[PDB]
Design a protein around this nucleic acid. Structure first.
Ligand SMILES: [Mg+2]
Ligand SMILES: [Mg+2]
Ligand SMILES: [Mg+2]
Ligand SMILES: [Mg+2]
Ligand SMILES: [Mg+2]
Ligand SMILES: [Mg+2]
Ligand SMILES: [Mg+2]
Ligand SMILES: [Mg+2]
Ligand SMILES: [Mg+2]
Ligand SMILES: [Mg+2]
Ligand SMILES: [Mg+2]
Ligand SMILES: [Mg+2]
Ligand SMILES: [Mg+2]
Ligand SMILES: [Mg+2]
Ligand SMILES: [Mg+2]
Ligand SMILES: [Mg+2]
Ligand SMILES: [Mg+2]
Ligand SMILES: [Mg+2]
Ligand SMILES: [Mg+2]
Ligand SMILES: [Mg+2]
Ligand SMILES: [Mg+2]
Ligand SMILES: [Mg+2]
Ligand SMILES: [Mg+2]
Ligand SMILES: [Mg+2]
Ligand SMILES: [Mg+2]
Ligand SMILES: [Mg+2]
Ligand SMILES: [Mg+2]
Ligand SMILES: [Mg+2]
Ligand SMILES: [Mg+2]
Ligand SMILES: [Mg+2]
Ligand SMILES: [Mg+2]
Ligand SMILES: [Zn+2]
Ligand SMILES: [Zn+2]
Lengths: 48, 79, 182, 136, 49
RNA sequence: UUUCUUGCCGGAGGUAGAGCUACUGGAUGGCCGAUGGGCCCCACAGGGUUACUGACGUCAGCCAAACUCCGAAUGCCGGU
RNA sequence: UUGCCUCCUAAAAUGUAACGGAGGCGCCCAAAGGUUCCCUCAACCUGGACGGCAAUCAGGUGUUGAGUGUAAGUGCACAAGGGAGCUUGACUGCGAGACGGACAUGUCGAGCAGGGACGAAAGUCGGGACUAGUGAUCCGGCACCUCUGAGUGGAAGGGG
């Protein structure tokens, strides 16, 4: 874990379009994402 | 009608200079060589051109130490 | 006081799953995932040395760590490639950055595939070290679309303690990896 | 002609031509063979002539094994020239033969024709040889 | 020459103590290194003449 | 007597010989069989058939002043 | 062709000739020098978008077949091979004892002191894995020195 050379990394809140809530961490300076196709949206993931 | 070769260099007189059981002074050089064909042993040092010399007075004796031919100087007893 | 969630679910249910359906004498023989390696093998940078910059930037934003620049340790006449030329960039992820990156990929980025049809189950190197590629860096939402300059594929490797593809595949499925069903 | 594709050194010393053949003294490929009795330099000219002789005599079906190879070059300095000015250019090829070495080996159904083809070959060689059978 | 002979002189006494070689194509500027000065008695910088 | 000879003891070698599946090269005949060759159904997918050429490998017999996994006799250095 | 270096001839110490058989040299590197620490290649199989045996990634097999500035030989995996940090010992005063030797050349060297570099310390360091990359004396140039200075003081000139 170096001093400051790595890109900024903070906890982030990810909300799905179909209503799933992901509690994660990313390099997003905002820390907030909403996604319309997720693990419960794709026809291949949930068979729909 | 001419040979494109015919050159050679001087012989460097390499080889073992003191053999086993031979009493030497401290500092005598004992074997002249190119690589490390004989590795420095106990109380024997190695020179810049890989020349083995004696770091103490005694008798020369060769050995093998983990698959390496080595040269050692053995302290003869003082009369 | 805080842990990644997917590692939590792993320990909670996948460990018992792997134990009870693979039946190890030692509870420590229950396998698991060890590391992931993302490699952008750029290679064509033998002329454009400036493309590796976008390579390392986008890979850093997705992975959260700054790649080591991988040079070329051979001299070859064809590709205009000399020794010591930056050719690729790699990051290894272990631990919390490990699990969080796996989240960002499989729950987010891997859904973002256009024309997705799964990932082949025969993609193991004999012992369960699963390695797959792709050809577009625009399935990662960490990067905006127009902000890209060239279409680039990553190189995603998951290295696990499988003894063979059975442990590797059982693990990857148990972790929630949408394979191709052959 | 039997010529090596390349030799590491193209001007060697004359092969030492003393002793008894230690390696290669048994008949192993075919059933009859020609087995040497004198030291010599069997050039590829001799080998080719002998092989063609065997093939002409048997002429039907049977295997001829030339288990010696001419791969040692003898040089010769150009004519009318004095001594000196270095070694010549290699211009013939040789197998070094000791007394004991099976030179040619033959596999063929009958006996007398095989023996006659082998002696037809022997007549083309610069040495004394003898026909040796697959058994002690 | 591309690897000419050069001399090194102590700054604090201006005595030329060492002569060496260096590549002018690779070291265009004067070479300076901390060498030993026999009359200054200690290690001093030495600069190309 | 330091010289020399003979016996014994302590040494370092890479020659003769030999060996090579121990290296570098040469090199004989088999064996399986590729990749790359041709064809069928017919696609340049895929599959098999065929003097295919036949990588690699492997069986057996060999070769070398500038080869060596090995390896003397003599000579040489020292001691006694 | 003529000096130097490496190998074979060269007959297991050293040395050994020919218009005998093969090649190199007349450099290069302020790091490719010093020290401290860390690492192990080449090739092969398997899995991967460009990417094809081949480029970078991952797993395995892999004790030396890779590499060592540069010919060849002897070496080196304990690494002398790959990587990073600091740094100038690519030192000054010397040198017991030796190898080689017609002579003149040449070559190795522990150890002492000064002043340093690296290292916690032990210690190592008087260029480079080693053996080529060089030219005697005369004569002259230059910088420094506490020497000399043709009656004396300087100077010129000589000397180290
Ligand atoms: Mg020589
Ligand atoms: Mg040295
Ligand atoms: Mg002989
Ligand atoms: Mg025999
Ligand atoms: Mg033999
Ligand atoms: Mg006859
Ligand atoms: Mg520089
Ligand atoms: Mg005696
Ligand atoms: Mg004896
Ligand atoms: Mg012996
Ligand atoms: Mg030899
Ligand atoms: Mg022999
Ligand atoms: Mg050869
Ligand atoms: Mg020999
Ligand atoms: Mg000799
Ligand atoms: Mg001899
Ligand atoms: Mg002579
Ligand atoms: Mg020349
Ligand atoms: Mg070095
Ligand atoms: Mg250094
Ligand atoms: Mg590997
Ligand atoms: Mg090193
Ligand atoms: Mg110097
Ligand atoms: Mg002296
Ligand atoms: Mg000191
Ligand atoms: Mg010293
Ligand atoms: Mg030196
Ligand atoms: Mg004169
Ligand atoms: Mg006067
Ligand atoms: Mg006066
Ligand atoms: Mg004056
Ligand atoms: Zn969704
Ligand atoms: Zn000074």
């Amino acid at each position: 874990m170096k001093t400051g050379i790595h890109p900024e990394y903070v906890d982030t809140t990810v909300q799905c379009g179909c209503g799933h809530s992901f509690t994660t961490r990313s390099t997003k300076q905002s820390g907030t994402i909403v996604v319309e196709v997720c693990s419960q949206c794709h026809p291949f993931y949930t068979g729909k | 009608s001419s040979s494109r070769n015919g050159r050679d260099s001087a012989a460097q007189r390499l080889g073992v200079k003191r053999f086993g059981g031979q009493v030497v002074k401290a500092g005598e050089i004992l074997v002249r060589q190119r690589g490390t064909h004989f590795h420095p042993g106990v109380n024997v040092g190695r020179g810049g051109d890989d020349t083995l010399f004696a770091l103490a007075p005694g008798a020369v004796e060769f050995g093998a130490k983990r698959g390496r031919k080595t040269v050692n100087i053995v302290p003869v007893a003082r009369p | 006081k805080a842990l990644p969630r997917l590692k939590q679910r792993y320990r909670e249910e996948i460990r018992e799953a792997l134990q009870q359906e693979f039946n190890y004498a030692n509870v420590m023989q229950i396998p698991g995932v060890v590391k992931v390696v993302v490699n952008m093998g750029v290679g064509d940078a033998a002329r454009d040395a400036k493309l590796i910059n976008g390579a390392i930037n986008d890979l850093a934003l997705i992975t959260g760590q700054k790649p080591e620049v991988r040079r070329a340790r051979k001299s070859i006449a064809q590709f205009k490639l000399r020794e010591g030329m930056p050719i690729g960039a790699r990051v290894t992820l272990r631990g919390d950055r490990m699990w969080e990156f796996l989240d960002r990929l499989i729950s987010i980025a891997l859904p973002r595939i256009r024309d997705f049809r799964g990932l082949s189950p025969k993609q193991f190197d004999g012992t369960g070290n699963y390695t797959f590629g792709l050809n577009e860096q625009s399935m990662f939402h960490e990067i905006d679309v127009d902000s890209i300059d060239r279409p680039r594929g990553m190189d995603i490797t998951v290295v696990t303690t499988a003894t063979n593809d059975a442990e590797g595949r059982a693990l990857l499925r148990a972790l929630g990896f949408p394979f191709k069903e052959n | 002609m039997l010529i090596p594709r390349k030799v590491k050194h193209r001007k060697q010393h004359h092969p030492e031509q003393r002793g008894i053949a230690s390696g290669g003294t048994s008949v192993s490929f075919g059933d009859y063979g020609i087995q040497a009795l004198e030291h010599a330099y069997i050039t590829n000219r001799q080998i080719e002539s002998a092989r063609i002789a065997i093939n002409r005599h048997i002429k039907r079906g049977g295997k001829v094994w030339i288990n010696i190879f001419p791969d040692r070059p003898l040089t010769k300095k150009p004519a009318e020239t004095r001594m000196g000015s270095g070694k010549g250019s290699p211009e013939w090829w040789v197998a070094n033969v000791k007394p004991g070495r099976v030179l040619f080996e033959l596999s063929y159904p009958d006996e007398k024709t095989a023996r006659d083809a082998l002696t037809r070959a022997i007549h083309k060689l610069p040495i004394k040889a003898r026909i040796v059978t697959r058994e002690e | 020459d591309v690897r000419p002979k050069i001399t090194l002189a102590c700054e604090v006494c201006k005595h030329r103590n060492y002569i060496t070689k260096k590549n002018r194509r690779n070291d265009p500027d004067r070479l300076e290194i901390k060498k030993f000065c026999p009359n200054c008695g200690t290690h001093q910088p030495h600069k190309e003449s």
